[PDB]
Design a protein around this ligand. Structure first.
Ligand code: 3PE
Lengths: 57, 63
């Protein structure tokens, strides 16, 4: 009672049931470096302007 | 101009110039630390963007 699969059947992506759990760290990755702290808040005018030498603006 | 106006105008001038001078010193020390440690917004040289990586299953398994 064996039926030959039709054209395209054997190339299907199928689902399979299993007990074995999904590996947690398959690449054995280390802990990622901490991100640089976020800079946040209200953007205010520069204090006394550019402050380049004598410029007052 | 009376002495009081000139006197207190000078204190206004001195305050701004003192505040700016302190900020200039702070900027030089902040720049020194940010460059040495790379932990601040300045001197942030780009690394490869990780959104370019493709995580799809490949033609072979071990990758
Ligand atoms: C350039 C004029 C001096 C000519 C001699 C040249 C000297 C050497 C030049 C080297 C650079 C030194 C310049 C020194 C000034 C810069 C420092 C400074 O003052 O920064 C702030 C300045 C505005 O000065 P502020 O105290 O805010 O006064 C406000 C008044 N409403 O904001 C600025 O930085 C810009 C000020 C530049 C000064 C000229 C602009 C004043 C407006 C004149 C424009 C002309 C209007 C008439 C147009 C006629 C058209 C027919």
């Amino acid at each position: 009672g064996w039926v030959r699969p039709d054209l395209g059947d054997l190339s299907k992506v199928t689902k399979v049931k299993t007990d074995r759990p999904l590996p947690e760290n398959p690449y054995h990755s280390r802990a990622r470096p901490e991100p640089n702290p976020e800079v946040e808040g209200d953007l205010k005018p520069a204090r006394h302007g550019s402050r380049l030498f004598f410029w007052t603006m | 101009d009376g002495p009081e106006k000139n006197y207190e105008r000078t204190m206004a001038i001195l305050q701004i110039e003192a505040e700016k001078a302190e900020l200039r010193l702070k900027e030089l020390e902040v720049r020194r630390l940010m460059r040495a440690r790379g932990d601040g917004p300045w001197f942030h040289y780009p690394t490869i963007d990780k959104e370019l990586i493709d995580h799809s299953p490949k033609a072979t398994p071990d990758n």
